[PDB]
From a paper:
The Vip3 ([name] 3) family proteins from [name] convey toxicity to species within the Lepidoptera, and have wide potential applications in commercial agriculture. The Vip3 proteins have molecular masses of ~90 kDa, and are secreted as soluble proteins that form tetramers in solution. They can be proteolytically processed by trypsin or insect gut extracts to yield products of ~65 kDa and ~21 kDa that remain closely associated in solution. Vip3 proteins are proposed to exert their insecticidal activity through pore formation, though to date there is no mechanistic description of how this occurs on the membrane.
We first examined the structure of the wild type, full length [name] by single particle cryoEM. The 3D reconstruction of the tetrameric assembly of [name] with a global resolution of 3.9 Å resolution was obtained (0.143 FSC threshold). Our [name] structure reveals a tetrameric assembly with C2 symmetry. Each tetramer comprises two dimers formed by conformationally distinct A:B monomers. Each monomer of [name] consists of 5 domains. Together, domain 1 and domain 2 form the N-terminal, largely alpha-helical portion of the protein. The two domains are connected by a contiguous alpha-helix (α3, residues 94-162) that interfaces with α2 (residues 61-88) undertaking a super-helical twist that gives the complex a distinct conical appearance. Domains 3-5 make up the C-terminal portion of the protein, primarily composed of β-strands. The interchain interactions that bring about the conical morphology and impart the C2 symmetry are formed at the interface between domains 1 and 2 on each of the monomers, with the rest of the complex not involved in oligomerisation.
Residue numbers in the entry:
A (entry chain C): 152 to 251
B (entry chain B): 27 to 653
C (entry chain D): 52 to 151
D (entry chain A): 52 to 101
Amino acid sequence: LSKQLQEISDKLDIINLNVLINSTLTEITPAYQRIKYVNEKFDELTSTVEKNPKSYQDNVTKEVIENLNELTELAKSVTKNDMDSFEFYLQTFHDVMTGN
Amino acid sequence: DYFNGIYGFATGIKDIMGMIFKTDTGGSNLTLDEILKNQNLLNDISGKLDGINGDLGDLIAQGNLNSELAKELLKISNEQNQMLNHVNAQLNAINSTLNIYLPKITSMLNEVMKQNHVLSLQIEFLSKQLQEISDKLDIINLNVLINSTLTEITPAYQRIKYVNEKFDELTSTVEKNPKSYQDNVTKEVIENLNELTELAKSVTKNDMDSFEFYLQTFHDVMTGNNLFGRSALKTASELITKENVTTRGSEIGKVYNFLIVLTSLQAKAFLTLTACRKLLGLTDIDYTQIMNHHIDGQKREFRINILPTLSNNFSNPSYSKNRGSDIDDPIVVLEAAPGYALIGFEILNDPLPILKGYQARLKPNYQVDRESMSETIYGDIHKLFCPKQLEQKYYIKDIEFPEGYVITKIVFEKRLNQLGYEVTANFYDPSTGSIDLNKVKVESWKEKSCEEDSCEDEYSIIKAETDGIYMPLGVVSETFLTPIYGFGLTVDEKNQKITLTGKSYLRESLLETDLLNNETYLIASPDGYISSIVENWNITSDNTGSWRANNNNAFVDKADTIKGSSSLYTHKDGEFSQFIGNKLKPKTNYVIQYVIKGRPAIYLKNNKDTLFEDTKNNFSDFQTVTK
Amino acid sequence: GGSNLTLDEILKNQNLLNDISGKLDGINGDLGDLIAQGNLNSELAKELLKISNEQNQMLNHVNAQLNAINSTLNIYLPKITSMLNEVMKQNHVLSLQIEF
Amino acid sequence: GGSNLTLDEILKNQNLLNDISGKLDGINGDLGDLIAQGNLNSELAKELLK
């Protein structure tokens, strides 16, 4: 049902009341972009899953610097989930979708 | 020269990355916090305090002293040692940096600057070309879908371009290792230090909740994966295919040029990001995979759901009213060499109405050779295109040969104001680039009545008005020179304007090479001329070749007035000489053009006659003139 | 009090660092007093003095960190908590003025 | 000028230099009054004097 949305995308050349769909999109699309971006950081999580079999076996005190690296990408991404930020974007997105 | 296409450009940026990715950092934690201007000052403190502390510590180590006095002196020793230790720690950090790191980093950065400049020369042309396209496009009757992509893309684009610009220029204006920013005197450590600090501040600001968000979403909007999947590529296609945009090149040319601009932007940004990372400390990230994946995604988009919808039809960009003739039967032939092929046209009038025709050999998959190119200039083309107070018969056809053939000779016929022509094509092989010379096809008549019945009818006519007929004006070619298989004339006498038109192989010329990631070889449309009787007329290499200056006030000087380009400089006696007599055939017209700043003294002299001389105009900023 | 409430302070080792500080203080005091006794082999004195310097440096930076943490958790957090608790109630009161 | 060699970290170096001056003065005071106690061999005083 994600793809079917494109079957509307191609044929939604709609006019004559575009002020509303200018206002709403200009207001919503940043949060949407950001949420999708955060999500794709979990395709790179899957990349770390692919990494996993390369170090799942040598967890005998070697991980202390091996697997403290090899995931620093996530260790960063997560730190970008605080501090007057992404939480905010999720919240305001919900607020608009509900219409508050 | 050549433009090696988006795939080659990506390979170049990837090689630059692979270069910078490896060299070194030693960790070295380039945090700007280091005062870095007291490498001299702290050294004095370190030395003096070291001497004092050593003296006092040795006095203690002598032993044999009053016990409480020993405790007091030991506490003094501890305090002094603490102060000195933290001071020399700061100094040691600074000096370790200014000896181990700045040489390494400066070297790598200087290396990255040159190859960046080289790759920028690969799109300098299309930069200004897209600028011009932006100048002549109007968005009237736009849909909400357009405003959609505009608001979805504009901030990311703004910031990506800004960063690319800023970093790329700062790569240059940062003093290199000659100074090594050393303690040498000062004010090198004000200015070079300010610039280094600014580089540091910029690269630092590239690791947060931004700019790996901006890049990604930019790529997404391009591919068309936003909240309702409208690729900005498609909306740009729609905007461009809207008319009133009549400039050089067809639809495919313009949209592909747009995608070139954007893909070059993205690759440059990836390079900048990796450079920032290496310039900071550790955790290199091999972005090449993501960059290639994104580029291939955008190219797949462009290939699948835009390209098959566009036309290779291309028209003259402008028109011009001109008074021609009727009592003449002008005949014009534009016949490429037997191993050549027509690759576009151009109409100029400033010296006089002139049609110019380019020709060249072919490389496989409809690729043109840079050399073997040739420009040919023809005379009073208006007299073929324009009447004088009498009607003009114009037979109008969309002549096109089958695929694999290439238009190889276009002969014009105007007989008592009846303007027809002759289009002859030869066979060509895309796999080998070879053009056959024994399988041709001809077209003698220029209408649809002859197209369906081989009967003479269905021309169009123009009633000669007073001031002149709007004749074609400008360039007749795709943005990239390309053998054409379609040609025609489509005059619209309703407003008394004529228009040429052809169909280009550009689609197949690239679909086999670029969008399949192979060695592409295109050539941007030459804005001006390409050859000259004057050998090395384009003096830039600080070498004169056949040019000669018989005075030291006449010198070559790549930076004559600026390093941007050379322009033979002469002051108060300067004379640049070149024997040219052997090549000018007698009793033949010649057009002259040159870009001159100041007031030079120009002469075409055989020591007896000066066939031309201009010594009057004063030009502050390199005005070009043609006579 | 200025008190520079920078979060950097580990602030969960106020116990752990104290053990290190105490033990190293005892050791350094013993060795320094042994030196201050004087009347000892000169080069041996130089060696022990260098050991003293190294230990004193380590201990000094450690107890500096501890002193920052403890100065905070004694001088600042009471003050700040009091002021914050005070600001909470009056905020709530004023919010009752526009709840409707 | 002055910051011709600085970057309005005149203040940063200024405070650093001030702290260093304070610590050095505090050390010098203890050294001086320990001298004032005196009552030592000449060299074991003269070296401290130096």
